[PDB]
């Protein structure tokens, strides 16, 4: 019994199982057609994807994950799969939506790298990119979701979009894992389809959306700490944005959000301290050192701890 036979059997089995146990069998099929023999991925694609219609939240979450891996293995599949993904982003269940946001966080970069590396570009591939781009647009709108979890995932998505759509600079601090990630500066100014300047503007607007979000007076504890942390990352990786981030910190510290409960206020404010200290250590914070120091001291930071975090 070969792989293809061992797969047809696993699927016949999965079509008959009536519960979440079927995910195990599906995960094994995944391993076998994405990793152990990708030549079979196309043959059995439609049949894994059709599980997108299953009533089970977990089976649907597994399908988004499968999409994510199929697309990392062969980015051309995104020509078909982007519709399924955008529809799963609109799932009535919050846990499916959230998985969708996390997968887009991965695939957006990947798709953009593919558009940029591609010399000649078919109309279809252009449309696919417009799809991905608009799905990013949708997730940005999810910052107005009424669900606290959706918001938090939306923030992280928006965070990565801002890093991706802006240039790495000499004084950028870049995490080992993301070394080979596309960034604006890797995109040729004369590309036949990807427009360096449209992208630079879309990052700026994304960052404007986030800064607006921070100042919603009804902002939740967790949303605020998340947004605070995303600005610390953006600030470190993209120090052309240092001034906006510091100003966002300044704004929060004058204007504490009045729906926060006492302990929520404490939680958020312990993170504000931590992100100020972490930014102070960055060389591009120089200008604003006394403005940061004023802020830190006002929150009760002791000076042996302030001084450990100079550059």
């Amino acid at each position: 019994m070969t792989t293809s036979e061992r797969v047809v059997d696993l699927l016949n089995q999965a079509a008959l199982i009536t519960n979440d146990s079927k995910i195990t069998v599906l995960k094994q099929v995944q391993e076998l057609i994405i990793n152990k023999d990708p030549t079979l991925l196309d043959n059995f694609l439609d049949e894994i994807i059709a599980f997108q219609a299953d009533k089970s939240i977990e089976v649907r979450k597994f399908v988004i994950g499968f999409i994510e891996e199929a697309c990392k293995r062969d980015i051309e599949l995104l020509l078909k799969l982007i519709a399924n993904l955008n529809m799963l982003l609109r799932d009535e269940n919050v846990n499916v939506v959230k998985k969708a946001i996390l997968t887009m966080t991965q695939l957006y970069k990947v798709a953009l790298q593919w558009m940029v590396k591609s010399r000649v570009i078919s109309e279809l591939q252009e449309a696919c990119w417009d799809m991905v781009s608009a799905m990013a647009g949708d997730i940005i709108l999810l910052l107005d979701s009424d669900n606290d979890g959706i918001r938090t995932h939306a923030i992280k998505f928006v965070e990565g979009l801002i890093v991706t759509l802006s240039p790495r600079m000499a004084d950028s601090e870049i995490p080992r894992r993301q070394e080979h990630d596309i960034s604006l500066d890797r995109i040729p100014r004369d590309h036949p389809y990807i427009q360096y300047n449209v992208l630079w503007e879309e990052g700026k607007a994304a960052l404007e959306q986030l800064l607006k979000f921070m100042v919603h007076p009804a902002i939740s504890s967790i949303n605020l700490t998340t947004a605070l942390g995303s600005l610390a990352n953006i600030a470190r990786q993209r120090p052309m944005f240092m001034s906006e981030v510091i100003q966002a910190y300044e704004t929060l510290h004058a204007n504490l959000p009045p729906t926060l409960a006492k302990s929520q206020v404490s939680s958020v404010r312990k993170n504000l301290k931590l992100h100020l200290l972490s930014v102070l250590k960055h060389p591009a914070s120089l200008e604003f050192q006394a403005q940061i120091t004023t802020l830190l001291v006002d929150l009760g930071t002791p000076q042996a701890e302030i001084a450990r975090n100079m550059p």
Partner: protein, 190 residues
């Protein structure tokens, strides 16, 4: 369900009292310490007994009854080591853990800081959030027992919600007002 981690400093008392309650009531639970060293109470509060996390519970048991059989029976440390042995061979450092959780609960603010500091400094790969919650539990048998039951009511309560992320904060507030205790709450990312 809900994959939970309970975290304190030495992974001896408070964090194992919770481990034990959660485990016996069907949670999937792991426990850890964050401190630099494992500290057991000694002859005087200023001179505790100090070990590396590589050290077995059983080992500490005999290192201690080599010191003062009497002092460690009376102060309940021996019974605790024997209880911990039955759950887990050795205490575990949070900073060395590689597994993912839905909810990390800390038993002291200082530890909450260490957990946050640790999770914020790791390679972020996925942006999956994990919720971190503090409750201050003094380090003694009685409070540790009380704090374990409270942590168990909490997780049992979180497990009854339809949507954890959307309502955890309302529940924690309900719990502050019932219990008289404050619950710090933050998220880190994987």
């Amino acid at each position: 369900p809900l994959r939970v981690a309970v975290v304190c400093s030495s992974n001896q008392n408070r964090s194992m009292e919770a481990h034990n309650i959660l485990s016996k009531r069907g949670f999937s639970v792991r426990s850890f310490g964050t401190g630099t060293h494992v500290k057991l109470p000694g002859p005087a509060p200023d001179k505790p007994n100090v070990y590396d996390f590589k050290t077995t519970y059983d080992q500490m048991y005999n290192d201690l009854l080599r010191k003062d059989k009497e002092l460690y029976t009376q102060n309940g440390i021996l019974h605790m080591l024997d209880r911990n042995k039955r759950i887990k061979p050795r205490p575990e450092r949070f900073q060395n853990c590689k597994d993912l959780f839905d909810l990390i609960l800390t038993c002291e603010e200082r530890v909450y800081d260490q957990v946050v500091e640790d999770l914020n400094s790791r390679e972020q790969e996925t942006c999956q959030p994990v919720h971190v919650v503090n409750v201050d539990i003094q380090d003694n048998h009685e409070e540790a027992t009380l704090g374990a039951f409270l942590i168990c009511e909490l997780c049992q309560c979180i497990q009854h919600t339809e949507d954890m992320e959307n309502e955890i904060d309302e529940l924690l507030q309900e719990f502050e007002e019932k219990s008289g205790r404050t619950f710090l709450h933050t998220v880190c990312f994987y």
